Amino acid sequence: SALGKLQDVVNQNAQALNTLVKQLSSNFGAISSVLNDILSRLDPPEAEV
Amino acid sequence: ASVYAWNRKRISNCVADYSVLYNSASFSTFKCYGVSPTKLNDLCFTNVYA
Numbered sequence: 001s002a003l004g005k006l007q008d009v010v011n012q013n014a015q016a017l018n019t020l021v022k023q024l025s026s027n028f029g030a031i032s033s034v035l036n037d038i039l040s041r042l043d044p045p046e047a048e049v
Numbered sequence: 050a051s052v053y054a055w056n057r058k059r060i061s062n063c064v065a066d067y068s069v070l071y072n073s074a075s076f077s078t079f080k081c082y083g084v085s086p087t088k089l090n091d092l093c094f095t096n097v098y099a
Contacts, residue, residue, distance in 0.1 A: 041084050
């Protein structure tokens with residue numbers, strides 16, 4: 001634990017990145033979190049929504 | 050079937066050509082939801098219920 005101060009910095013940033021990446025799995029109300037699935041299923045007028 | 054006792058046919062393990070239905074002159078209504086009728090032949094489904 002002696003170098004906890006430096007490890008804390010590493011952990012906070014790694015956590016921030018991991019959270020940011022995981023947000024790409026969120027639908028946010030969309031039919032899918034995967035952009036390619038939306039594009040392959042819907043026409044532009046509906047895909048844009 | 051009567052609408053109160055509607056029939057459900059489970060379709061699986063087959064090739065589905067939807068353009069035959071969509072390009073037909075014989076249907077008065079053909080409304081797709083959650084999917085484009087012109088992209089159906091490019092999609093795969095785990096199952097289709099008719």
